[PDB]
């Protein structure tokens, strides 16, 4: 659903839905190529 | 030969970037082609 979220201090508006990318164990969010984030991990459940 | 380079999602219709929108052309390839 179109949300507006804050995960751990990051804040946005935009779509979750489940990811299908392998952070690595201490990455807590991504970026695309622009340097825009694209993807998040949950903080209580370590989602990505 | 020629390939995009476009740094975006890719839909039928990150989408539209962040406010930046692509429009199409009035002629398609095929109608070009014709
Ligand atoms: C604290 O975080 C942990 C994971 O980082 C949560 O543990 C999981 O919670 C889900 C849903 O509550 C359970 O289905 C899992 O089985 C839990 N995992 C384990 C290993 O127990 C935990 O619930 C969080 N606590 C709170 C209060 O939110
Ligand atoms: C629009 O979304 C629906 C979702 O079920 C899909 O079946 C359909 O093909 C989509 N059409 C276009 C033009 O994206």
Known sequence: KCVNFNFNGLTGTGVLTKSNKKFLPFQQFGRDIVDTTDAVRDPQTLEI | ?34
């Open chain 2, 1 to 34: 030969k020629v390939t995009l380079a476009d740094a975006g999602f890719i839909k039928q219709y990150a989408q539209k970037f962040n406010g930046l929108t692509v429009l199409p052309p009035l002629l398609t390839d095929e109608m070009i082609a014709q």
